[PDB]
Amino acid sequence: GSLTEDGLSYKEKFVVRSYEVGSNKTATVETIANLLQEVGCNHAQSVGFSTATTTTMRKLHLIWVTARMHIEIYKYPAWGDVVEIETWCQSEGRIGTRRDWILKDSVTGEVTGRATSKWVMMNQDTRRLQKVSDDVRDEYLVFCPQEPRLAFPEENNRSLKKIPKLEDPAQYSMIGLKPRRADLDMNQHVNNVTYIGWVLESIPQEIVDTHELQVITLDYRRECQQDDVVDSLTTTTSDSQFLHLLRLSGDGQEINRGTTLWRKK
Amino acid sequence: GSLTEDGLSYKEKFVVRSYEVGSNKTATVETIANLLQEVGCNHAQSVGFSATTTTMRKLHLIWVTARMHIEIYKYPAWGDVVEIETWCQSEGRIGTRRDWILKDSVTGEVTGRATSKWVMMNQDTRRLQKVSDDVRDEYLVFCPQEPRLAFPEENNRSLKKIPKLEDPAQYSMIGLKPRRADLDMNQHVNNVTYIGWVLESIPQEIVDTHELQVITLDYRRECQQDDVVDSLTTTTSNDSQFLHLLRLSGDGQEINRGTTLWRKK
Numbered sequence: 001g002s003l004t005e006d007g008l009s010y011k012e013k014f015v016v017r018s019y020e021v022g023s024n025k026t027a028t029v030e031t032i033a034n035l036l037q038e039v040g041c042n043h044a045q046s047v048g049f050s051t052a053t054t055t056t057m058r059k060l061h062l063i064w065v066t067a068r069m070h071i072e073i074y075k076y077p078a079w080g081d082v083v084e085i086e087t088w089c090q091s092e093g094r095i096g097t098r099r100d101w102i103l104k105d106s107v108t109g110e111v112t113g114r115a116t117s118k119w120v121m122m123n124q125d126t127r128r129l130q131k132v133s134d135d136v137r138d139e140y141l142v143f144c145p146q147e148p149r150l151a152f153p154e155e156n157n158r159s160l161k162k163i164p165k166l167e168d169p170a171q172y173s174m175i176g177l178k179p180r181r182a183d184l185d186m187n188q189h190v191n192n193v194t195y196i197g198w199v200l201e202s203i204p205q206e207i208v209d210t211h212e213l214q215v216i217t218l219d220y221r222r223e224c225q226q227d228d229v230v231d232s233l234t235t236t237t238s239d240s241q242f243l244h245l246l247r248l249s250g251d252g253q254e255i256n257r258g259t260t261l262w263r264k265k
Numbered sequence: 266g267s268l269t270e271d272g273l274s275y276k277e278k279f280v281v282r283s284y285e286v287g288s289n290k291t292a293t294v295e296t297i298a299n300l301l302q303e304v305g306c307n308h309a310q311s312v313g314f315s316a317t318t319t320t321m322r323k324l325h326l327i328w329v330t331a332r333m334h335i336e337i338y339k340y341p342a343w344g345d346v347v348e349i350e351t352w353c354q355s356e357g358r359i360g361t362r363r364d365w366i367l368k369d370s371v372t373g374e375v376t377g378r379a380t381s382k383w384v385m386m387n388q389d390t391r392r393l394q395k396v397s398d399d400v401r402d403e404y405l406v407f408c409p410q411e412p413r414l415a416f417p418e419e420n421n422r423s424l425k426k427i428p429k430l431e432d433p434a435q436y437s438m439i440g441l442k443p444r445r446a447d448l449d450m451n452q453h454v455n456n457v458t459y460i461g462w463v464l465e466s467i468p469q470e471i472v473d474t475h476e477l478q479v480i481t482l483d484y485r486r487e488c489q490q491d492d493v494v495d496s497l498t499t500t501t502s503n504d505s506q507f508l509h510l511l512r513l514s515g516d517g518q519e520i521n522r523g524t525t526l527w528r529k530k
């Protein structure tokens with residue numbers, strides 16, 4: 001992978017692997033999410049960030065955390081195919097940062113998917129949200145386009161929709177979900193792609209066998225610890241739409257909420 | 266990736282990804298196992314296979330893993346290039362063996378090696394059978410005729426008989442269930458999931474202070490999508506040895522058994 005001519009965005013080509021595909025021999029939505037994560041890490045590596053916290057973020061125990069992740073896929077890359085992903089960042093004033101992705105077929109050059117994520121500042125010890133100071137902004141703005149560049153431009157689009165809380169009783173459920181060591185990242189925290197998988201575990205197998213995931217919007221409220229147990233809840237709201245909710249199996253503490261949209265194969 | 270000059274082996278280079286590493290910022294033993302699987306699939310793709318030969322498809326026969334043995338000296342770091350070479354060999358009428366050599370792409374030194382024993386089996390009834398002559402001729406033209414062993418040594422650990430773990434186990438991880446990410450393209454549980462499940466009963470203190478040097482896994486039964494697994498471990502031993510056993514949470518039906526060897530960091 002490499003930064004573009006202007007150094008204000010990064011591109012990388014990936015060859016879809018055998019174990020990265022589902023029953024239809026195309027990459028899963030979790031393989032795609034992992035690829036988005038990898039190109040994002042490589043973009044921060046290429047612009048100076050060590051093994052993406054700035055200088056002011058290190059002195060003050062501050063980290064970027066995901067608050068929302070929205071993905072729209074038109075075509076899932078087949079096993080053995082090359083997918084090209086372009087990623088960039090933009091300041092959202094004092095609220096935080098946004099990271100966008102464009103997925104293209106390396107052969108045809110056509111856009112096959114797009115994603116957007118909203119990140120907020122947070123103390124890594126107390127977990128208190130806070131806001132992007134002023135000294136922090138100057139350190140990362142030199143790597144962002146100043147003019148807006150939105151993967152989801154549309155006025156009144158799916159990525160900025162308010163998601164309600166799933167009302168009990170849920171239509172479907174997957175209980176007793178626990179992260180293993182493969183679900184953890186290098187910092188021993190549950191990887192954000194695991195939550196996508198957990199949300200999709202309560203979708204019935206018949207829906208998965210006859211439909212394809214077109215859109216998925218996930219809101220992150222709290223982190224699931226290594227020793228926490230999760231319940232995954234789904235209710236049809238409708239193409240098929242679903243409302244989702246992940247909560248701790250014990251006290252019922254909310255960790256995630258979202259929506260999915262599926263299309264007949 | 267590409268076949269060697271003689272067309273009797275295949276090589277492929279991989280760049281270790283961000284989400285593929287553990288707490289030490291080096292690839293996990295499951296990332297390595299997935300890479301071995303990917304280069305094996307690409308080797309079969311490059312030599313004509315659309316795993317199954319013309320006679321195997323006529324008879325509804327498939328290759329299944331009976332044993333997997335991996336020995337790692339160095340785990341590739343995040344961002345590093347690992348080069349893996351793989352080949353196959355006929356084991357008379359017992360079945361086939363697939364071997365792997367892992368090298369550092371910069372230094373050229375061997376950093377790991379693996380060996381697997383595959384047996385012939387009816388896809389439908391699940392009954393094992395010897396390799397017939399007509400099947401042998403179809404795949405022999407892609408194997409070296411002279412032996413080429415990744416583990417040559419006279420009394421080596423890859424051919425050791427593994428005993429059954431006696432109850433009560435020293436350690437345990439109960440209620441393990443595969444999710445959709447744990448399934449392959451044919452909706453069967455991927456063999457790397459069993460490695461992860463075996464390692465779930467190893468205490469976190471052992472994982473934090475030691476590195477996995479050797480792992481030998483014997484496959485007795487396939488775990489279904491709706492099956493629940495219990496993972497059992499007992500210390501058998503500067504170095505630490507463990508005896509492992511995976512069994513169905515209900516009836517206690519054996520699905521896997523193995524051993525691991527760890528070294529102080």
Ligand SMILES: CS(=O)(=O)NCCc1ccc(F)cc1
Nearest residue numbers: 044052064089099119140143
């Ligand atoms: C939360 S993030 O969007 O992943 N990173 C914000 C800081 C950054 C800004 C521009 C970069 F080229 C790399 C990192």
Ligand SMILES: CS(=O)(=O)NCCc1ccc(F)cc1
Nearest residue numbers: 328353361362363383404407
């Ligand atoms: C993957 S295997 O079950 O270990 N071997 C099957 C036969 C084969 C032999 C040589 C090849 F180049 C590819 C496949």
